[PDB]
Assembly symmetry: C5
Homo-oligomer: 204 residues x 5
């Protein structure tokens, strides 16, 4: 229940411990989800964008940037990666969905669909997560690694417990996002830890 | 048969097992043909796009992507290769025709003609094929190779027993193909084996 | 004798044998000429575009492609080379003229003039040629070299016994050449030898 | 006391001597500032753009160009660097702001925001500066280094004791800057030392 | 006394001999000048564009192309160099001015200003030159060097005994120069030596 409309989290330096915890009362394992957000970073090294771990389970749901032009999704430790043409540095809008019944993962980058990949067909993502921005978890809520830290700005984050169709992804990118039931930027419960500053969104 | 209008086959992972068999009652050897389809892959390694083998004959008709910008056609184990400027990764529309009487093979990539090449003048492509998407055959229906597997999405596949003129290739590129008498995406007889998922086409 | 309007010669493979002889009743040594044609090849190695030899004289008039972006004209074994920015692979329209009185050679690529060069001022190109497409001659009509063979398509070839002014070069580039009196694609006397196929021009 | 509208300082050669002192009446420590200026240089090596040293303190506020596409701000010897896509050589409009309360530094290059970075949260930039263009100070007003000298043109320099919002940054980029209370190009007190020439600005 | 409107000098081959002498009747030292001309060359090696030597003084005023994108001016044996983004090969319009009082040299390439540089403040360029196109002088009228020779085309050359403001530079670039008093293409006194041919300007 904070409205972050028009605002970003700024992670202004590299560190082991600067991060934001995102709080959701998620009790039911996820069969389907979509996650969208905008990010702006001038790192060239690898970094985590969104880290969701559960007790005893590393990389339960992880969105990770390998290198320029390459986005990975981990589900239950397993991973897929898809490629895109992108400028560097540049702001980006990222959406990723995953559907247990097919295993299909869909990345959409600036409203453009990447090649579909598939993993973990039939699996359910475990509930009661710890969700972190700014660092990559290796434990339940911690064991960070500064070489995977996100330095830069993140905004307009939403997470739904369904697979959004293309029209709803384009709405998030450049229209009005559909209100979201797991995490929603207009009513976000978060905890800042360390050096993270909230500022207006000034980039597109 | 099945009308896959608006849908693609998704080969969501690298494997030696995942494939689609395409069924056609082709009993008479082929003198002329055109094959068109759309594909979207972010593989950089080589892969097979369309594998047609007959009893005792490898690479009887094979469309093979050597590397970015380079397309090969095999007829009766002989090959030609032509080059094109293309972005990577990117969706592509591919048409290729071959005419026994001249030996001429014509690739068209996104409605643009590649340099003509020639092979197997006077040859007849044998009938009673096994036709596979997703893997390259080295036997009659099998002996796949993971390093040649196709990972990504294929749709809008049509095959004619004649050489299409430019206007009919552009029609196919634009999404209004002429009726096709060997394989037709709107009345396709196929078998999924392994991990292949049918999804809507979202990238055209 | 044959009107090849709308048609190309296709040299569909690398060889030391495949060629076209162009026949013209040229009995008087040439003081001035312009030669225009369209070509489409995806070779990266060097190749001959137009080979004119006379008895006892190799490289009497030769248009040669050194590498991407570089065009050479030989007159009586001496050469000039001019450079241009071009895409690869791409169709190209090439015009070259030479004027004995000044020695000036003008290349025009896709209707744009290259830097003028000069050679053989005062020379007359010898008459009674053998003129070959598809191979580079080292004798009077023969002694070909596979490594200089042209693979690809040639069309719209015209040769005048004068130096065309710019607006006449542009007319030829646009597909409306002024009347040509040495070689004329719309009334061409030729001989196919080996594997050369006439097909419609589909890339203009 | 001088309106330099429409004019630039030209540092026409590499040297360890040529520089401009900028004189400001500011006597209180700075908690917030914005600095904007336009520069045109064809140096590839690193160079100082704006050097603000105070007695006893090197690099108290320093704007430094590491290499093409990379801009650094030093505050009290600590630094941040942000990246941008830019052509070389090219004129550039540079703005940078810093806010003590958050430590946030914002670079804007040709009206486009770079990724925010943070340093020196809670710090006060010392007053009674010597402010130098053309050279990088290693002492209070001197100790220059030829290899960090600025060669080229600088104009349209303004410095405010506040953090400008995006609209006011864009106004400056577009040529209608707000009046500026630390340094103002339209009412500037300066001292030329060595070879620095004032000329009309011809490159906007 | 010759009007070369619409014509160029073509230096069609590398040599240590081919050149044009340009003769001015204005006999006076130069405190200010501007020189404009068009050039088209596909050399990659260094070459002289305009060579002005006086008795016993080499490199008294020299415009020299170091390599792609780099232009140098020598005044009295001292030099400056400025860089520009340009295509290769490409026609170019070059203007350069120099002002003794400030030492400032201004290059303009296709109507766009390069970074100003400065040299020889207070010097007077000596009177009674030999002015050569096509070769770089090392003596008064001679001692050429084939590795510095200009191959290609030069036209629309004008030289004024003043520093042109930007609007007059743009007029020259656009083909409507102000009449010029040191050298003027519409009333030029020149001597061709060796192989230099006058042809129409076809590349503007
Ligand atoms: C996931 O979606 C599938 C099909 O769209 C549906 O069967 C299932 O109920 C969804 N799961 C949940 C928990 O909503
Ligand atoms: C194949 O094409 C050739 C050339 O157009 C034609 O003559 C022949 O009839 C065709 N063959 C069949 C089986 O249609
Ligand atoms: C070749 O061109 C020159 C120069 O224009 C001309 O004088 C000469 O007559 C021409 N030669 C011919 C037509 O044989
Ligand atoms: C510095 O800038 C901030 C802008 O958020 C402002 O709130 C604060 O009052 C300023 N401090 C001073 C000393 O002016
Ligand atoms: C040189 O040019 C400047 C303007 O650029 C002018 O003010 C000055 O009078 C000129 N000097 C002469 C003509 O000697
Ligand atoms: Ca982890
Ligand atoms: Ca980790
Ligand atoms: Ca095979
Ligand atoms: Ca195989
Ligand atoms: Ca030869
Ligand atoms: Ca040869
Ligand atoms: Ca310093
Ligand atoms: Ca220093
Ligand atoms: Ca010299
Ligand atoms: Ca010399």
């Amino acid at each position: 229940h904070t409205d972050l409309s028009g605002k970003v989290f700024v992670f202004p330096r590299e560190s082991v411990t600067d991060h934001v915890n995102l709080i959701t009362p998620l009790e039911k394992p996820l069969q389907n989800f979509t996650l969208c957000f905008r990010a702006y970073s001038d790192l060239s090294r690898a970094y985590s964008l969104f880290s969701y771990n559960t007790q005893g389970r590393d990389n339960e749901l992880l969105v990770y940037k390998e290198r320029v032009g390459e986005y990975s999704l981990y589900i239950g430790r397993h991973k897929v990666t898809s490629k895109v043409i992108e400028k560097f540095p540049a702001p980006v809008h990222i959406c990723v969905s995953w559907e247990s019944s097919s295993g299909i993962a869909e990345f959409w980058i600036n409203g453009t669909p990447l090649v579909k990949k598939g993993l973990r067909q039939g699996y359910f993502v475990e509930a009661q997560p710890k969700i972190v921005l700014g660092q990559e978890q290796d434990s339940y809520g911690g064991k960070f690694d500064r070489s995977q830290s996100f330095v830069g700005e993140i905004g307009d984050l939403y997470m739904w417990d369904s697979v959004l169709p293309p029209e709803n992804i384009l709405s998030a990118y450049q229209g009005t996002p559909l209100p979201a039931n797991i995490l929603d930027w207009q009513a976000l419960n978060y905890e800042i830890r360390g050096y993270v500053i909230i500022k207006p969104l000034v980039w597109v």
